[PDB]
């Protein structure tokens with residue numbers, strides 16, 4: 220996934236609060252999340268891919284092998300089971316917890332990196348540009 | 351309540367989607383509501399006060415006597431029991447349904463009419479100016 224490697228900064232967000240509402244994020248956490256303009260850093264070392272999100276109030280990091288299910292603690296503190304595969308040139312992530320699931324797709328669009336999150340019909344689109 | 355009589359147009363809204371989320375309004379209805387820039391029309395005839403909200407997709411109207419509980423069907427289709435009193439120069443409305451309650455205060459601030467809605471700690475502020 221060489222096309223994803225680098226540091227990206229958030230430029231626009233659409234329906235993110237609605238997505239968080241659907242996932243079940245609390246009011247306070249939703250407000251902090253909506254204020255943050257995180258930087259996403261993606262790197263690859265051998266077969267391990269690392270996706271790091273940095274913001275003044277919270278940094279997250281996940282290192283994984285494409286196709287192998289792993290444990291992830293989300294920014295909003297959910298303990299989920301995640302699997303990320305490379306399909307059609309996009310990184311497709313599925314998070315599962317308490318009988319629920321949500322999909323997060325990270326793809327390239329022109330010179331931008333687009334992240335699309337879907338939870339029960341509600342779709343959020345976040346656009347990132349290179350830092 | 352002569353200070354309230356007239357036609358008012360929405361100028362600003364703050365935390366309205368969060369308030370609707372707390373009240374339990376569905377995604378589609380929340381999106382339509384957030385797009386509407388309603389006009390509020392208040393009139394008094396004898397001891398009956400009428401508050402009418404007009405928008406391209408939905409008009410609502412309630413006529414009541416201050417201090418007497420009445421039935422109201424909200425824009426989002428809730429069947430509630432409402433009571434409106436005049437306190438400190440403000441119209442204070444309490445809606446009750448299914449063991450829940452929310453407060454809606456309509457007050458004058460300068461030349462503006464401010465509507466504040468509170469549901470379990472979440473507060474929304476909508477400002478109106480004369481049309």
Ligand SMILES: CCCCC/C=C\C/C=C\C/C=C\C/C=C\CCCC(=O)O
Pocket residue numbers: 239244248249251252253255257259272274276277293294295334336345
């Ligand atoms: C990525 C989170 C940005 C905000 C961080 C601060 C607080 C987080 C609080 C709640 C976040 C809830 C869900 C976010 C999880 C995945 C979305 C990643 C979207 C992106 O990649 O943009």
Ligand SMILES: CCCCC/C=C\C/C=C\C/C=C\C/C=C\CCCC(=O)O
Pocket residue numbers: 370375379380382383384386388390403405407408424425426465467476
């Ligand atoms: C007043 C509603 C404006 C939007 C109308 C269109 C659709 C309504 C759908 C859902 C509305 C849900 C709750 C609104 C009820 C009271 C808030 C009045 C606020 C104001 O006086 O602004």
